[PDB]
Ligand SMILES: [Cl-]
Ligand SMILES: [Cl-]
């Protein structure tokens with residue numbers, strides 16, 4: 232059926248210009264591949280606070296991915312992941328913002344560091360949540376587990392750990408192998 | 415998993431140059447949208463006889479549909495669909511020709527007239543068969559009914575009827591709404 236997918240990307244102080252660009256490229260690639268499908272998209276940059284770069288209505292109005300993200304500016308601040316996730320659940324997934332009523336909700340969280348805040352993401356528990364942890368900040372198994380709480384279960388399918396930002400290209404390659412025209 | 419898909423397109427005399435071109439356009443549109451996925455394609459033109467325009471190996475070596483179908487010459491003869499389907503079953507789905515051993519076999523038959531031969535297609539029965547009947551030769555319930563025996567069950571899912579070749583543009587729009595990234 233319909234799929235309303237939200238990209239919640241890390242814009243923290245740790246990211247180098249090229250790394251931030253690779254995150255933007257990844258989001259665009261998936262969007263272009265899935266253009267003219269039953270998917271609709273929204274994008275929110277998060278660091279210390281949260282900013283919807285374009286919401287569902289924006290995408291519907293102008294499907295152009297490159298145009299939708301042409302305005303993004305790297306925040307360069309903290310990594311308040313609990314707040315960011317709750318922000319999507321209540322401020323982005325809204326009918327008035329273009330979200331479709333009984334559409335399946337999906338969240339693709341991309342981050343390069345552990346969350347600097349805490350609390351709960353209970354309000355977002357019914358959204359299908361994928362998280363992509365990139366870079367040396369996720370070298371240890373300990374740091375990787377910290378991401379499970381944000382993603383759906385099992386972690387084996389929903390939590391993806393990438394050692395480099397270059398690997399985002401590999402991940403896109405792999406996701407395309409999972410694309411099918413369903414009966 | 416892996417999907418080996420063969421397009422079997424009508425090259426009969428009834429087809430005008432632009433109608434035959436729209437059939438090719440449909441095939442290429444499909445292939446382009448499904449590029450870099452688990453799908454691999456082969457195309458066979460049929461009329462009085464049959465011709466593999468490119469096989470699975472060719473597709474793999476040069477994944478460019480436009481380049482893959484540039485030499486196609488409209489046969490302009492009859493409509494031997496029974497023989498054609500049997501040819502795909504035994505002369506196209508072959509590992510030496512690029513077909514993957516246990517990939518799901520799918521056959522997309524595109525035609526604008528009733529078969530001019532008879533027999534059976536028992537040998538192609540394990541292949542998921544879709545048939546697209548286009549035009550004036552299918553304006554009666556009887557003519558449309560004859561297409562059923564070539565496709566998988568139920569006909570309501572595997573038989574597609576288009577009043578015009580223009581409609582192949584519509585059909586492609588429709589099928590894309592069924593494109594999803596599987597878990
Ligand atoms: Cl950081
Ligand atoms: Cl004909």
Ligand SMILES: [Mn+2]
Pocket residue numbers: 241243244245246310343344
């Ligand atoms: Mn960071």
Ligand SMILES: [Mn+2]
Pocket residue numbers: 424426427428429493526527
């Ligand atoms: Mn014909």
